[PDB]
Design a protein around this ligand. Sequence first.
Ligand SMILES: *[C@@H]1O[C@H](CO)[C@@H](O)[C@H](O)[C@H]1NC(C)=O
Length: 161
Amino acid sequence: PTCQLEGDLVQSAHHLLRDLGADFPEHCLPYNAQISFPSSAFPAATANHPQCHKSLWVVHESLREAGLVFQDNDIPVGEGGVTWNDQKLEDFQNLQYRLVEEGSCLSSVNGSGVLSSYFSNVTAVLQEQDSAACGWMALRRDLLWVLKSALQKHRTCFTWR
Ligand SMILES: *[C@@H]1O[C@H](CO)[C@@H](O)[C@H](O)[C@H]1NC(C)=O
């Protein structure tokens, strides 16, 4: 295994996740107290220090932990649920799985608890029926940002073509 995250998969995962839903709704704003992605998890790249290992770790670990969230929690669909494109969701999850498997070496090093703490807060919101839809929408918002930011600020860390 060459342990690399393929940029084309990351870009396509971002596009599918973008296209399957809508903007984060105003009524979900209070959940930002609980679901606040630690943007400081990404390193500040400098000349000769792209910090690709840490940047790829943030992407891989966020996708791995989100995979567990999808496995362990039902998405509500009715009123009080989310209105997502289920076919594009399945396609996103297939790309997510490919990225998590190919980057397994990035999870072989224990990281700071900063990401696990974020996902523990997401889980708590998802596992109460009255807050679940907002939790799903906040998670999607943050995963979109993780993928967008990695491509915008850490493009060189992915393998292309
Ligand atoms: C989790 O939510 C609590 C509030 O319920 C907040 O104080 C804490 O900072 C959150 N954890 C993270 C990692 O953001």
